[PDB]
Design an enzyme around this catalytic site. Structure first.
Site, mmCIF file in Angstrom:
data_model
loop_
_atom_site.group_PDB
_atom_site.id
_atom_site.type_symbol
_atom_site.label_atom_id
_atom_site.label_comp_id
_atom_site.label_asym_id
_atom_site.label_seq_id
_atom_site.Cartn_x
_atom_site.Cartn_y
_atom_site.Cartn_z
ATOM 1 N N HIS A 184 16.111 4.535 -30.053
ATOM 2 C CA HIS A 184 16.379 3.438 -28.869
ATOM 3 C C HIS A 184 17.121 4.227 -27.781
ATOM 4 O O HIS A 184 18.076 4.798 -28.038
ATOM 5 C CB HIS A 184 17.256 2.464 -29.468
ATOM 6 C CG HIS A 184 17.325 1.213 -28.460
ATOM 7 N ND1 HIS A 184 16.495 0.534 -27.732
ATOM 8 C CD2 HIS A 184 18.468 0.715 -28.076
ATOM 9 C CE1 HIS A 184 17.081 -0.353 -27.010
ATOM 10 N NE2 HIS A 184 18.399 -0.270 -26.872
ATOM 11 N N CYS A 198 12.367 0.391 -23.734
ATOM 12 C CA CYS A 198 13.601 0.464 -23.506
ATOM 13 C C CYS A 198 13.970 1.944 -22.931
ATOM 14 O O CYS A 198 14.948 2.080 -21.900
ATOM 15 C CB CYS A 198 14.345 0.790 -24.783
ATOM 16 S SG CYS A 198 13.806 2.106 -26.217
ATOM 17 N N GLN A 201 16.874 -6.144 -21.364
ATOM 18 C CA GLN A 201 15.331 -5.848 -22.026
ATOM 19 C C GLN A 201 14.727 -7.232 -22.429
ATOM 20 O O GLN A 201 15.587 -7.951 -23.252
ATOM 21 C CB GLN A 201 15.407 -4.742 -22.820
ATOM 22 C CG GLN A 201 14.227 -4.535 -23.582
ATOM 23 C CD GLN A 201 14.092 -3.285 -24.318
ATOM 24 O OE1 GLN A 201 15.178 -2.834 -24.568
ATOM 25 N NE2 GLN A 201 13.044 -2.740 -24.530
ATOM 26 N N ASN A 206 23.598 -0.074 -23.589
ATOM 27 C CA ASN A 206 22.429 -0.661 -24.362
ATOM 28 C C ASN A 206 21.586 -1.582 -23.492
ATOM 29 O O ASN A 206 22.089 -2.606 -22.780
ATOM 30 C CB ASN A 206 22.663 -1.563 -25.666
ATOM 31 C CG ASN A 206 21.357 -1.864 -26.382
ATOM 32 O OD1 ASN A 206 20.337 -1.830 -26.124
ATOM 33 N ND2 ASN A 206 21.637 -2.466 -27.588
ATOM 34 N N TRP A 234 19.493 -3.532 -23.837
ATOM 35 C CA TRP A 234 19.481 -5.096 -24.287
ATOM 36 C C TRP A 234 20.369 -5.768 -23.560
ATOM 37 O O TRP A 234 20.326 -7.233 -23.218
ATOM 38 C CB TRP A 234 19.794 -5.216 -25.793
ATOM 39 C CG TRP A 234 18.652 -4.561 -26.482
ATOM 40 C CD1 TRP A 234 17.501 -3.876 -26.318
ATOM 41 C CD2 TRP A 234 18.572 -4.586 -28.080
ATOM 42 N NE1 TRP A 234 16.694 -3.585 -27.310
ATOM 43 C CE2 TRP A 234 17.716 -3.729 -28.487
ATOM 44 C CE3 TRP A 234 19.485 -4.894 -28.908
ATOM 45 C CZ2 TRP A 234 17.215 -3.577 -29.736
ATOM 46 C CZ3 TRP A 234 19.209 -4.591 -30.391
ATOM 47 C CH2 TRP A 234 18.129 -4.024 -30.674
#
Ligand SMILES: *[C@@](O)(C(=O)NCCCN1CCN(C)CC1)[C@H](CC)NC(=O)[C@H](CC(C)C)NC(=O)OCc1ccccc1
Ligand SMILES: [Ca+2]
Ligand SMILES: [Ca+2]
Ligand SMILES: [Cl-]
Ligand SMILES: [Cl-]
Ligand SMILES: [Cl-]
Length: 322
Positions: free
Chosen positions: A240, A83, A77, A264, A266
């Protein structure tokens, strides 16, 4: 065959750009501030001012559409509230069949390249083919939004751009619902589960869904407002979207323990409780189980026991296909 979004014809545009000796520029989603956004990414905003639109072929000598497969590690991300979308893309990669409907085969920066790519989405009650030119938002030569852990790989940046296009702008993607992205990739049926009122057979439901290639995501509700931070004491992010990427069982001191794996979007920042990459629990399973399951890497992906999962998380979303 997918029908063409806005009547834009990928193969015809590509062939005509090649004949005319030019690279595609998309009138329907052009490389200007209005494609970024309207407020936080509007024409007069701090974020907008530093961004320059550049093609991967302007950034690197050897850009690649796909490197070592289109996989979940390719989803890291950037600076945008999408997200939910990225969790959905990461999940999508686990099902080769539906992955390659959304991301058509045979796209490249080499032979036949003319600065245009395409993707297929479930939209307006139709499977639609959506084109984009490969101009991407960059700052100091780096992608601003989604990027791959493989720095020369571009399919996920391009897919996020196509999804932005159908929604009007990148900023239009900030804040959303994982299930919406799931549906937009599958035309499937979505259901959610309240983890504080989980059915007794929820783990079996999860195993079955994963087996059939259904898409799964989870989140932790921010119930107070943001008080105990966005990040929890054990390094989970609240409000998230996470992708649920596996469910496996281990033998912990001679007793089965049900585990669940999530990621995640990210591509970093993970759970630090039991079963996390560095936790003591792995010391006490079958050595083979440890070697098959545990990966000591800051990659955003980690295991939890199902017991801890249903305590820490609050919502699970599952999109079932045919
Ligand atoms: C989501 O958590 C998100 O995109 N966060 C951005 C994190 C920025 N990264 C940090 C790491 N570095 C390396 C790169 C930048 C997002 C924030 C708003 N969360 C959501 O969109 C929520 C997802 C649910 C599954 C919980 N949904 C949400 O907030 O709903 C709000 C909403 C609903 C409808 C319309 C507008 C907004
Ligand atoms: Ca890859
Ligand atoms: Ca990890
Ligand atoms: Cl056009
Ligand atoms: Cl501008
Ligand atoms: Cl390529």
């Amino acid at each position: 065959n997918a029908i063409k979004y806005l009547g834009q014809d990928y193969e015809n545009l590509r062939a005509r750009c090649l004949q005319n000796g030019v690279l595609f520029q998309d009138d329907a989603f052009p490389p200007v501030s209005h494609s970024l956004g309207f407020k936080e990414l509007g024409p007069n905003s701090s974020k907008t001012y530093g961004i320059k639109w550049k093609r991967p072929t302007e950034l690197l000598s050897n850009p690649q559409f796909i490197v070592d497969g289109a996989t979940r590690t390719d989803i890291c991300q950037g600076a945008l509230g999408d997200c939910w979308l990225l969790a959905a893309i990461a999940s999508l990669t686990l099902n080769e069949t539906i992955l390659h409907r959304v991301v058509p085969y045979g796209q490249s920066f080499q032979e036949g390249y003319a600065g245009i790519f395409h993707f297929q989405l479930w939209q307006f009650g139709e499977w639609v083919d959506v084109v984009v030119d490969d101009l991407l938002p960059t700052k100091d030569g780096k992608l601003v939004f989604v990027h791959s852990a493989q720095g020369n790989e571009f399919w996920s940046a391009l897919l996020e751009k196509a999804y932005a296009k159908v929604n009007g702008s990148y900023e239009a993607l900030s804040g959303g619902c994982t299930s919406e992205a799931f549906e937009d990739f599958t035309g499937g049926v979505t259901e959610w589960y309240d983890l504080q009122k989980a059915p007794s057979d929820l783990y079996q439901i999860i195993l079955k869904a994963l087996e059939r290639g259904s898409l799964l995501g989870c989140s932790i509700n921010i119930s107070d407002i943001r008080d105990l931070e966005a990040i929890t004491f054990k390094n989970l992010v609240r409000g998230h979207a996470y992708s649920v990427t596996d469910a496996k069982q281990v033998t912990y001191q001679g007793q089965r323990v049900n585990l669940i794996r999530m990621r995640n979007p990210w591509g970093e920042v993970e759970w630090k409780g039991p079963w996390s990459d560095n936790s003591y629990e792995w010391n006490k399973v079958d050595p083979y189980e440890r070697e098959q399951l545990r990966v000591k890497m800051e990659d955003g992906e980690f295991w939890m026991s199902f017991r801890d999962f249903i305590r820490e998380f609050t919502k699970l979303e599952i999109c079932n296909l045919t």
